[PDB]
Ligand binder design. Sequence first.
Ligand SMILES: [Mn+2]
Ligand SMILES: [Mn+2]
Lengths: 178, 178
Amino acid sequence: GSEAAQLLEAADFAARKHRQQRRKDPEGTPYINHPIGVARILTHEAGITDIVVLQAALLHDTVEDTDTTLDEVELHFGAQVRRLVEEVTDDKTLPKLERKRLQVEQAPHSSPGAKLVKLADKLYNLRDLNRCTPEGWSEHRVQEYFEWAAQVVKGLQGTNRQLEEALKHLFKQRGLTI
Amino acid sequence: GSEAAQLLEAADFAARKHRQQRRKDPEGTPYINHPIGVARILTHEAGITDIVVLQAALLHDTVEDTDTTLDEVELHFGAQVRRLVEEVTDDKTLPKLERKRLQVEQAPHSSPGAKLVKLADKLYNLRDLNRCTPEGWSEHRVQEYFEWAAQVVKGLQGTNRQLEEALKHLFKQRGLTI
Ligand SMILES: [Mn+2]
Ligand SMILES: [Mn+2]
């Protein structure tokens, strides 16, 4: 009913599903901080106000890494949100390398909404990598992540000038172009 | 900027400040889940849409338990929010028993916004206690909390029918009236 209630519903849902999950930083930061930050990037830097998109950002990793079904997502947020979540859900049954290939291949075919979420997700992760190296990650692994990230972003271009410029800038710092 | 951006700003701010904090439940759930749950109570059950009140709910424990100053809160959310946060910040320099006494005495003198946050905070904590006994907590300590909570809520009455009825019901189950 309310825009405020809608956002809190998604945040709460995500917080509960990710309650046992943590990031790979030395402090093992609560995972929920990530979805929240991704959504925030969209409102503050991308100027996104579409509630459907913001909810998908908050829930973008729920079906992927937690005990959540597509039906459950549609039940609480509608088919529009569920569909976006589908587009941003990696297939965890595939080898890591294969998943990376899929993201690159699927990038251009994503809906505008999914492209926004994918862009914000990448921006949050690159900034986080620049801020702190994940536990057990070599510098080569970080650079590798950026290289792969570039492959994906190139397919998401023409969606949001603010996010793309920010991403392009961070990529340039590591010798990567668009 | 926008209602969406405003909620996410508070959510993000609180998530970062509470990143190292955890609830007292067995699994040690990320503390951020509590403020998110309190604000959600306000939108979903109390029907609150006032962005200022919802932000205060999300930040209700920031100055109290984290490295956050009143000025920092005002800087990011304005004086209105900082004021509400002030009203809901317990003095951690006081012995626990004194803090409990303070909340009881202060209840009736709180502003409408502050009474809403206090009511939602209590409802979340009572439900949580009914759902799971905190680690190292005896059943008598659980009951003690309810008795104390009843004293505080009695002074917050006449603010929101939905929250007050819910609280009244939970209190009655444990032999406590209003
Ligand atoms: Mn993500
Ligand atoms: Mn609280």
